[PDB]
């Protein structure tokens, strides 16, 4: 029906680990059939796949395609033009996608368990937290010693923005529940965070016991024949 505004960038979960970056840009508005027109102004040896449509709001269709151009033009600042055309009105609002600027780093904290859960001998719980990062894309993984845990042992919420003073920032949490015998053995755990405003793309924090231990302890044993209790 009426044309709208839509955006789709490359995926971070494949941009930080592998080099299988795929661009896929969107512009919709469905009244007519296939009248396909592109803008891929760098097209340096890429062939755009197209496929079948899928389900939409009871009759309408929408189209897109993929360019595999991971030769670092995206984190340089190419603008990668997106603009439709049809036998229709030649007045688009356009999409021009690039690596964005004014980026900030996250600040990561890893919290110890509550002392109520320790004195019950069941599973205990840990909490990761990151806040202050400027685009809302982030990855969170857990480790045990050096082994990465499978990603169906832990829960991670989404990425939401904060109340602030002018500059806008974002935050995210996650939890992991382990057994109390593993905590009281002395095994360590870690939270890893990936983001694109970090220079080495990863940060770590690690926790165990003996981390927030106090540094001074006075023990006095008062024997018999010396009781002096006051009310």
């Amino acid at each position: 029906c009426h044309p709208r505004l839509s955006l789709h960038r490359p995926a971070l979960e494949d941009l930080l680990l592998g080099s299988e970056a795929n661009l896929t840009c969107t512009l919709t508005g469905l009244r007519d059939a296939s009248g396909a027109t592109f803008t891929w102004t760098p097209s340096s040896g890429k062939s755009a796949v197209q496929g079948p449509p899928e389900r939409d709001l009871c009759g309408c269709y929408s189209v897109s395609s993929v360019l595999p151009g991971c030769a670092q033009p995206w984190n340089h600042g190419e603008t990668f033009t997106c603009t439709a055309a049809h036998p229709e009105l030649k007045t688009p609002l356009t999409a021009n996608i690039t690596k964005s600027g004014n980026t900030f780093r996250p600040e990561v904290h890893l919290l110890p368990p509550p002392s109520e859960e320790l004195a019950l001998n069941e599973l205990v719980t840990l909490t990761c937290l990151a806040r202050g990062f400027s685009p809302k894309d982030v990855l969170v993984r857990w480790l045990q010693g050096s082994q990465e845990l499978p990603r169906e042992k832990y829960l991670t919420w989404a990425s939401r923005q904060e109340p602030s003073q002018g500059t806008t920032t974002y935050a995210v949490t996650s939890i992991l529940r382990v057994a109390a015998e593993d905590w009281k053995k002395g095994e360590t755990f870690s939270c890893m965070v990936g983001h694109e405003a970090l220079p080495l793309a990863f940060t770590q924090k690690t926790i165990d016991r003996l981390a927030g231990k106090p540094t001074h302890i006075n023990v006095s044993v008062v024997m018999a024949e010396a009781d002096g209790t006051c009310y």
Partner: protein, 132 residues
């Protein structure tokens, strides 16, 4: 030694704390926590008479000393709601280590009076079981 965090009487433990702040180097202060335990050397494990030997092992968990469950009042928008303050006090079943000076403790013993036997009641702390 200024602000009382807990003063418990089933286990007879008391915990106070105090902030004492230096003015130079405002990044580091000290926070003190004082604990006092009084160990009874002549009480039984269950509190009746013939139970078991002297209790010789005494266990204190900080999360059960500081536990607070009597309800409170919170004002949210313009409303008074009653809230609980703890997860863990499901009703007792707590084993006490000492007596409490304002509660009184009795036992039941059978004795004979020539014919059949009665169900004589006996005070265990006589200062507190006076009927008035």
């Amino acid at each position: 030694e200024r602000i009382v965090l807990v003063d418990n009487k089933c286990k007879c433990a008391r915990i106070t704390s105090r902030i004492i702040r230096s003015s130079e180097d405002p990044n580091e202060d000290i926070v003190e926590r004082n604990i006092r335990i009084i160990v009874p050397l002549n009480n039984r494990e269950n509190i009746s008479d013939p139970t078991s030997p002297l209790r010789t092992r005494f266990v204190y968990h900080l999360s059960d000393l500081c536990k607070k469950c009597d309800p409170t009042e919170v004002e949210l928008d313009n409303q008074i709601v009653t809230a609980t303050q703890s997860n863990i006090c499901d009703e007792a079943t707590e084993t006490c280590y000492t007596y409490d000076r304002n509660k009184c403790y009795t036992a039941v013993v059978p004795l004979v009076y020539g014919g059949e036997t009665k169900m004589v009641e006996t005070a265990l702390t006589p200062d507190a079981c006076y009927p008035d």
